[PDB]
Design a protein around this ligand. Structure first.
Ligand SMILES: CCCCCCCCCCCCCCCCCCCC(=O)O[C@H](COC(=O)CCCCCCCCCCCCCC)COP(=O)(O)OCCN
Ligand SMILES: NC(=O)C1=CN([C@@H]2O[C@H](COP(=O)(O)OP(=O)(O)OC[C@H]3O[C@@H](n4cnc5c(N)ncnc54)[C@H](OP(=O)(O)O)[C@@H]3O)[C@@H](O)[C@H]2O)C=CC1
Ligand code: SF4
Ligand code: SF4
Ligand code: SF4
Lengths: 60, 134, 154, 101, 347, 68, 395, 199, 216
């Protein structure tokens, strides 16, 4: 354990360091369907998959 | 997945699989490629009622075009299933389910909003991002 | 005669205590501990305790779970249908005193408010051996009674 | 005093976007379904003062404080001791609701 | 309505709470005969209001089971071994008690206990023991309405003699004298029904001429509470008769009607014949244990008490002095119990 | 609107008895018994005013009394 | 001028009361039946409503964990697991790998006992009593593991925010491994008595038929989905612990009848045995609870030697940790389906709102659709496959 | 096994479907028509001779002769681990001085609010409790109070035989808890010494 | 749509890349742009599905809830075929006290969405049972616990609370112990309800620190 003689919570404080940003969305600007379906596969070969996360986050 | 039946059956037959997992309950029809093409074209005809400069209509047009393309290059009906991550039967039922809510969307007309419409969006920033690095 | 009456009452106590027909009012967690207590590993049928589905044929009643205001009338109705000896055992903190749902709008603080309780078995859940200890305490209570001698000198 | 810049932002925003319909005073109390003698009880609306032991300003009405600090409290009623175990017994249903929630 | 205090000295200090189960009432009570029909309801009334009730009982755990539910923790104290001849136990029972209620009585004689013991010796002995203490403030004794020194029946005569002895030792005692009490566990309607249904013939002494004033158990239980809530009631005998005076023939007929019996099973066993049929059977009773087959009805004392009119004397205290309106025992909730048996749409 | 809610709740109260959700003893306890009790009640018209009676009874009038 | 045709009327509004060979708990069921066939079923619940959700609001977060154990007495670990996961998400707390493994292991163990009880109690409801007693000995062996780790056979309260309450006692992994060496043979013994039996087949085949669309419409989860042909598992589709590493296959059936769900549950027991073996072999070494002592209690020697640790111990066992303002819904694959907690925090030490999503609530709602056209005897089997727990249904 | 016959089913409508339609032969799980004479005899004798029944009969009959698993509860007791949470007990130091220092943390951590504590300064000057009562009809035996105590004063002993005949005896007090600690001192100490290694 | 088992082996993937992206970062913008009238505000926050991802929360008004739910279930790209639960949260500080929360699942998108309708005691929320059959009991529970009326519900009845219960228990103004208590009386051989008395009162322990900052 590297925390025995090296104590710094503010470096390891994730609870109080979360924040919420703000945006405004409007109907006038069109949605980018190029992003949604341009990256979509058109053939079986191009299919890409997201693997299951093996472990949940741990400090180590 | 693993079959829970002691009886030995072949799951590469691509019909014994469908009989085992109960796709027949979803639709008694075989669900060929031509049926999918017809369903997509009927959805395209249906969404004509929605105004031309409506984001919903553009979305349905884009999705139908993408799926008609995926039907285009892929001559195998199973290949369409692999690309679209679905059985052809449920892909066909999908367009009918879309057809069902068109009357409800034409009664309230959600696309009508004023030219100053603004929907505030609040986004969450994780501390792990900032603490580890910037 | 005072000797004969004593022999009769001790035989009657043996008969009543050895063959206890319990009816289990299994609301909640404790009913499964009772399930385990009547399983292979603890043989209640060796003790002579064998569960009977209907109240009319049961002489001991075990309240094992959280009694709610919705249920207490049904608990009392079941208790009234039982025959005259009718010993009642309260098992678990919920039945004994409301327990962990004590300060709730829907919970009765102890089945003692609704029905008289002879033996209280504490736990959450009470260990099965603890339930057998309570049943043996009730068996001792039955042995203690000398009804026929009291009948002679009444 | 600047801004919390957290979930409270969306909380306040949900507050200002939405609103409640006006009703006559006391009409909702009948809809609540509680005993009507509950509303015979009198209410004191106050903010707790700072404890003299501590020097923190969180509990006070201060620009630092971002939490609700105004309580509805009901008047104190009779309390007695359990004859068997000396526990504090009460018959007041509204004893701790106002302070707690 | 405003709750009225239990008029006991220094009650104002000890009392606290709304008057419910968990509240504190300043009444500690030793109710003799608690497991009986009358005693159980009195215990229920006293304990319901947060008071502590000491219940001496002859060893019988199953009989005293309902009394356990009556009160909160530590309020109903059940003393295991009660003997009417044991002074030390009586002193221990009334040690902390400021009111004592005596409901101990026997409907019939046995070999162990006679009327003169239970109805005379026990009241006198208990009266002396209560008098020497001084802490006990209120004493209530429960007796029959027809009890008189000049009564043919031995039960009703011994009861009156015991009441006079109690009045001698404690001058401030109140003698509650209810009529035939109707209840779910009563010995009036239940015995009449058992006579009508599981007996070959229902013998009725004379033609049912004897008049009675039956009262409901809840009314007597409330009357006990009203006695204890007023100190002005002390030293007075209250004849708690029912709202309506009825002949025994009317009650038998109305039971037959409510139960929808096919016809009248009652027969005329006139007096001077019961006095010959039951007279040896009394000597039989005094030499044999308690037997379910024969009791109460099958005695010369019952015939003697069913040839007189057990009604309240004209000038007398009653429910009106206690501001209670007695409920009719031939209609309403009182009669539900017999109603459940049969009403002609039933079975 | 409050009237609508109250009517819906009263309809629920009726439906409980009509559909046998509640039982006979519930009807006895909550309606018939109190009404019969009120008729059978005899009370002495108190000469003391309302304040005097509550003052004699309890320190805090707002607390309920049981078995009055 | 063409005659009209009249119809028939249904009566017999029966009341099916609390009944012992059924899913455990008290069930009041009002059934309208045309003759011997049911036309409407209206389950009456609230007989075990203890006001859990409102009681949570008056307790601190660590004080409210034992509520989740008692919500479902068959599967305690899975029930408290969702609560601790939601608090961890709001607190941004990372669980050490050993504790993640211990949680997955004991979750699989409670899954196995749940399936054992479900199958054997369902057989008892049918009327076969031998598998039931043959199963209690296994369930005792697993309760012994619980009493070893926590000191309580049923309500362990072992899962905590940031890890587990205590470490695994020495010798436990060997004992669990032995129980695993013999478990498959025991399950095969049970499987022969149930599977292949003509009376069991006749009682269960084509009873309680559900289709995939119906299951999604009514919000069903777990064995009900997988017996109809839906390849959906939270442990695979939405992993929540080191389940992603674990290698196991979803059991799938297609008919949707009672028998298919029974077969699914047996295969689920086998898959859980495989997951347990992987957990045993790959169990890491190190911390079992989070190193942060502002959300987890310090060790006893540490509180007895350090001032900061005594302060943290005092403020965690009196006030508790403060959870940042936010809302979260965390779901776990419980043995009965998907169990989720919707936790709303305003920044205090007590939950403002803790909604519990019952997997069995939607199944009991589905009872009416499933038990249409059936018989009075079929209701018991249909209830058995739903495997409803009424303390779990009535929070 | 898993395979099903056209005749055997539990639902009337499904029986009607299979009786009057041949969609069951399309389905893989069902058993197909025998197509040979010998297969017809095999299936006919299987159904008519109750074959599957007997196979379960032998495996059940194995139950008669296998080693019974049961415990004579009075004579033999089930295995109990050191961690076991049972009847509560207040503990004393080896000198005879109570370990309790009235921090009142166990009352704050009690999920069920079963502990009521009030204290004072003792004449010597120690922080000691004038009252420590636990409601065992309200306890849930979580063991949180044993976790919160900084001096090991309160422990859940190894005793599960503490049923009573009245509820008042289940309202423990300081004297009763101290007596329970005295009665089970050595066992509690051994369990704590073993448990200290882990935590 | 319906996750009918298709791939017999090698379905190790949580989902496809495109399906994940469309729902990881475009889902709220897509909803707002497609059906703008229904949406009033949107919040992206910690995910219901997982810790690592982000899931949307949409605030809509009671009048638009039925059409928004119908759009969410049957839109080709967004197929929220499942209603996980329906819940309400009481905020007495607000004029519109109750926030009715809807939790949905899209099996195809492997995503969770949360829909909030903010109402008060008098206003009603249209029932969504026709969209999801599971809603019936959830709306009945919301009516029982909080007192929120649901319009056009097939039969809105109380579920959890005792028969004859008129108060709504999960309202923040409702006492924790309630107002009444249940006991059997010997005199009247019935189980009866009486005003509450507590032998030992609930002890509220105020643990709040002045120095804390997380409290909002
Ligand atoms: C094939 C040879 C060709 C020659 C032709 C000869 C024809 C057979 C003549 C032999 C006479 C002996 C027959 C034994 C009795 C069986 C009667 C018919 C068998 C039968 O139909 O099977 C089931 C009846 O058995 C049951 O299942 C009843 C329940 C039994 C439970 C109790 C069992 C007791 C143990 C068995 C008796 C052992 C006695 C000694 C211990 C019905 O059911 P199904 O639906 O499958 O048939 C209907 C399918 N359309
Ligand atoms: N019809 C009525 O009920 C009426 C009754 N009364 C009078 O009220 C009194 C009681 O009424 P009720 O309760 O009906 O009579 P019960 O016999 O029902 O009650 C009698 C009580 O006295 C006890 N008891 C009797 N003999 C002895 C004894 N020798 N030693 C100790 N305890 C004894 C009994 O205990 P155990 O059960 O062990 O004997 C029982 O608890 C009687 O005197 C009766 O005359 C007044 C008006 C009418
Ligand atoms: S006492 Fe504990 S184990 Fe028993 S029913 Fe209540 S919560 Fe469940
Ligand atoms: S074990 Fe838990 S409930 Fe029992 S006294 Fe200790 S802290 Fe309280
Ligand atoms: S038992 Fe332990 S935790 Fe409880 S007051 Fe005493 S020292 Fe404190």
């Amino acid at each position: 354990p590297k925390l025995v003689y090296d104590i710094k919570y503010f470096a390891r404080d994730y609870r109080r360091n979360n924040s919420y940003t703000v945006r405004s969305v409007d109907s006038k600007t069109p949605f980018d369907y190029s992003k949604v379906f341009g990256s979509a596969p058109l053939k079986p070969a191009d299919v890409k998959t997201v693997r299951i996360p093996e472990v949940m986050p741990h400090r180590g | 997945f693993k079959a829970v039946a002691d009886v030995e059956i072949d799951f590469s037959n691509r019909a014994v699989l469908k009989k085992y997992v109960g796709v027949d309950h979803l639709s008694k029809e075989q669900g060929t490629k031509a049926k999918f093409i017809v369903s997509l074209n009927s959805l395209l005809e249906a969404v004509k009622s929605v105004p031309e400069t409506a984001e919903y209509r553009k979305a349905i047009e884009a999705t139908c075009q993408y799926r008609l393309k995926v039907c285009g290059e892929n001559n195998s009906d199973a290949a369409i299933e692999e690309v679209l991550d679905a059985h052809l039967e449920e892909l066909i039922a999908e367009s009918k389910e879309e057809l069902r809510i068109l009357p409800v969307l034409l009664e309230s007309k959600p696309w009508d909003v004023p030219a100053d419409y603004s929907a505030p969006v609040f986004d969450y920033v994780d501390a792990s991002t900032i603490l580890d690095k910037k | 005669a005072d000797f004969i009456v004593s022999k009769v009452d001790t035989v009657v106590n043996w008969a009543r205590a050895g063959s206890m027909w319990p009816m289990t009012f299994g609301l909640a967690c404790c009913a499964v501990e009772m399930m385990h207590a009547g399983a292979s590993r603890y043989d209640l049928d060796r003790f002579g305790i064998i569960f009977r589905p209907s109240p009319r044929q049961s002489d001991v009643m075990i309240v094992a779970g959280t009694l709610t205001n919705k249920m207490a009338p049904a608990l009392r109705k079941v208790y009234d249908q039982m025959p005259e000896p009718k010993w009642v055992v309260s098992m678990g903190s919920c039945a004994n005193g409301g327990g962990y749902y004590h300060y709730s709008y829907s919970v009765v603080r102890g089945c003692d408010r609704v029905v008289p309780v002879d033996v209280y078995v504490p736990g959450c859940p009470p260990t099965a051996e603890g339930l057998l200890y309570g049943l043996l305490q009730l068996q001792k209570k039955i042995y203690r009674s000398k009804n026929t001698q009291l009948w002679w000198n009444k | 005093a600047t801004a919390p810049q957290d979930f409270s932002l969306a909380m306040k925003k949900a507050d200002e976007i939405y609103s409640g319909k006006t009703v006559k005073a006391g009409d909702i109390g009948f809809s609540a379904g509680v005993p009507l003698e509950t509303y015979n009880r009198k209410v004191r609306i106050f903010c707790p003062a700072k404890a003299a032991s501590q020097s923190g300003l969180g509990r006070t009405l201060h620009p630092s404080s971002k939490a609700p600090q105004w309580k509805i409290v009901f008047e104190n009623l009779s309390k007695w001791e359990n004859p068997l175990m000396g526990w504090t017994s009460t018959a007041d249903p509204l004893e701790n609701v106002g302070r707690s929630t | 309505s405003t709750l009225k205090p239990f008029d006991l000295n220094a009650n104002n200090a000890v009392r606290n709470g709304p008057g419910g189960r968990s509240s504190i009432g300043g009444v500690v009570a030793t109710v003799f005969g608690a497991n009986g029909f009358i005693g159980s309801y009195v215990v229920n009334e006293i304990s319901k209001r947060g008071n502590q009730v000491v219940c001496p009982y002859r060893c019988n755990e199953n009989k005293v089971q309902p009394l356990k539910q009556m009160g909160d923790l530590g309020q109903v104290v059940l003393l295991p071994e009660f003997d009417i001849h044991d002074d030390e136990y009586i002193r221990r029972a009334i040690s902390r008690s400021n009111v004592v209620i005596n409901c101990v009585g026997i409907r019939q004689e046995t070999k162990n206990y006679s009327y003169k013991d239970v109805h005379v010796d026990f009241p006198t002995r208990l009266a002396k023991i209560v008098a020497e203490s001084g802490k006990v403030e209120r004493f209530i004794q429960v007796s029959e309405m027809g009890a008189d020194v000049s009564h043919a029946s031995r039960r009703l005569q011994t009861k009156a003699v015991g009441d006079e002895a109690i009045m001698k030792y404690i001058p401030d005692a109140t003698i509650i004298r209810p009529g035939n009490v109707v209840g779910i566990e009563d010995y009036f309607y239940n015995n009449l029904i058992f006579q009508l249904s599981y007996t070959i013939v229902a013998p009725v002494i004379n033609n049912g001429a004897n008049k009675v004033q039956p009262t409901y158990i809840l009314d007597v239980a409330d009357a006990v509470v009203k006695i204890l809530k007023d100190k002005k009631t002390s030293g007075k005998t209250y004849y708690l008769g029912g709202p309506e005076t009825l002949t025994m023939r009317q009650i038998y007929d109305h039971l037959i009607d409510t139960l929808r019996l096919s016809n009248d099973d009652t027969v005329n066993l006139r007096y001077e014949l019961a006095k010959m049929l039951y007279k040896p059977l009394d000597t039989l009773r005094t030499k044999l244990p308690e037997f379910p087959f024969l009791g109460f009805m099958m005695s010369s004392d019952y015939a003697e008490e069913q040839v007189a009119d057990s009604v309240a004397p004209a000038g007398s205290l009653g429910y009106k002095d206690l501001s209670i309106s007695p409920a009719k025992v031939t209609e309403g909730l009182a009669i539900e119990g017999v109603r459940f048996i049969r009403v002609g749409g039933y079975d | 609107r409050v009237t609508d809610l109250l009517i819906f709740k009263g309809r629920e109260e009726l439906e409980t008895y009509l559909f046998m959700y509640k039982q006979r003893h519930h009807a006895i306890t909550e309606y018939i018994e109190p009404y019969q009790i009120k008729k059978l009640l005899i009370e002495r018209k108190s000469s003391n005013s309302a304040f005097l009676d509550s003052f004699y009874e309890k320190a805090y009038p707002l607390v309920h009394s049981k078995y009055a | 001028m063409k005659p009209l045709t009249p119809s028939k009327v249904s009566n017999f509004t029966i009341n099916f009361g609390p009944q012992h060979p059924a899913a455990h708990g008290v069930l009041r069921l009002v059934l309208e039946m045309d003759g011997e066939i049911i036309k409407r079923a209206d389950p009456h619940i609230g007989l075990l409503h203890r006001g859990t959700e409102k009681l949570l609001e008056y307790k601190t977060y660590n004080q409210g964990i034992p509520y989740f154990d008692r919500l479902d007495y068959v599967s305690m670990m899975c029930m408290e697991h969702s609560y601790v996961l939601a608090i961890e998400q709001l607190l941004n707390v990372a669980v050490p790998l050993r504790g993640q493994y211990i949680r997955v292991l004991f979750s699989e163990i409670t899954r196995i006992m749940n399936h054992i009880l479900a199958i054997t109690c369902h057989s008892m409801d049918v009327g076969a009593l031998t598998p039931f007693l043959w199963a209690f000995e296994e369930r005792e062996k697993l309760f012994e593991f619980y009493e070893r780790v926590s000191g309580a056979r049923m309500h362990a309260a072992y899962f905590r925010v940031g890890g587990v309450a205590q470490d695994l006692p020495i010798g436990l992994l060997r004992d669990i491994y032995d129980w695993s060496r013999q478990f498959a043979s025991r399950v095969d013994e049970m499987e022969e008595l149930l599977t292949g039996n003509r009376i069991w087949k006749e009682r269960t085949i084509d009873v309680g038929l559900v289709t995939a669309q119906q299951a999604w419409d009514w919000g069903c989860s777990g064995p009900i989905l997988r017996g109809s042909g839906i390849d959906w598992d939270l442990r695979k589709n939405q992993p929540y612990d080191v389940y992603g590493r674990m290698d196991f296959n979803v059991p799938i059936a297609g008919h949707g009848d009672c028998y298919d769900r029974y077969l699914v549950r047996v295969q689920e027991m086998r898959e859980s045995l495989r997951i347990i073996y992987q957990c045993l072999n790959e169990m890491p070494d190190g911390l079992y609870k989070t190193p942060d002592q502002k959300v987890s209690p310090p060790s006893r020697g540490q509180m007895k030697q350090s001032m900061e640790s005594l302060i943290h111990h005092f403020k965690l066992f009196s006030e508790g940790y403060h959870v940042p303002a936010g809302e979260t819904y965390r779901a776990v694959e419980a043995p009965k389906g998907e169990f989720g907690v919707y936790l709303v925090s305003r920044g205090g030490n007590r939950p403002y709102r803790c909604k519990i999503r019952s997997p069995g609530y939607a199944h009991l709602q589905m009872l009416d659709m499933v038990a249409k056209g059936a018989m009075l005897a079929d209701v018991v089997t249909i209830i058995g496959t739903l495997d409803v727990v009424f303390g779990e249904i009535d929070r | 096994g898993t395979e099903r016959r056209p005749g055997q089913s539990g639902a009337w409508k499904q029986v009607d479907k299979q009786r009057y339609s041949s969609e069951w032969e399309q389905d893989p799980t069902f058993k197909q028509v025998p197509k040979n004479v010998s297969e017809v005899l095999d299936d006919s004798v299987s159904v008519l001779f109750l074959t599957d029944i007997v196979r379960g009969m032998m495996y059940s009959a194995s139950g008669f002769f296998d080693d019974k698993v049961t415990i004579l509860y009075p004579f033999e007791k089930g295995a109990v681990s050191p961690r076991f949470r049972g009847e509560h007990a207040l503990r004393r130091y080896p000198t005879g001085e109570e370990r309790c220092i009235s921090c009142k943390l166990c009352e704050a951590i009690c999920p069920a609010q079963a502990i009521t504590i009030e204290a004072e300064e003792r004449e010597d000057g120690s922080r000691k409790t004038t009252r420590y009562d636990i409601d065992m009809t309200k306890c849930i035996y979580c063991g949180f109070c044993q976790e919160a105590c900084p001096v090991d004063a309160i422990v859940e002993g190894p005793n599960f035989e503490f049923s009573t005949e009245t509820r008042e005896e289940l309202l423990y007090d300081k004297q009763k808890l101290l007596e329970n600690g005295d009665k089970w001192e050595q066992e509690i100490a051994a369990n704590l010494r073993t448990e200290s290694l882990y935590r | 749509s319906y996750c009918y088992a298709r791939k017999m082996t090698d379905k190790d993937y949580i989902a496809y890349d495109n399906i994940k992206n469309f729902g990881d970062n475009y889902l709220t913008d897509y909803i707002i742009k497609t059906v703008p009238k229904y949406v009033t505000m949107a919040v992206n926050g910690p995910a219901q599905s997982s810790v690592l991802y982000q899931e949307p929360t949409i605030y809509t008004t009671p009048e638009h809830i039925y059409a928004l739910c119908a759009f969410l279930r049957d839109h080709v790209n967004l197929q929220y075929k499942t209603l996980i639960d329906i819940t309400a949260v009481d905020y007495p500080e607000r004029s519109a006290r109750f926030e009715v929360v809807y939790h949905l699942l899209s099996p195809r998108l492997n995503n969770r969405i949360r829909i909030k309708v903010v109402v008060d005691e008098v206003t009603s929320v249209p029932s969504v049972s026709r969209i999801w059959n599971a809603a019936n009991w959830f709306e009945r529970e919301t009516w029982d616990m909080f007192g929120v009326f649901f319009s056009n519900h097939p039969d809105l009845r109380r579920v959890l609370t005792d028969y004859g219960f008129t108060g709504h228990p999960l309202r923040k103004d409702f006492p924790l112990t309630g107002y009444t208590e249940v006991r059997y009386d010997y005199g009247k051989k019935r189980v009866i309800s009486e005003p509450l008395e507590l032998t030992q009162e609930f002890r509220y322990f105020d643990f709040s620190s002045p120095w804390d900052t997380l409290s909002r």
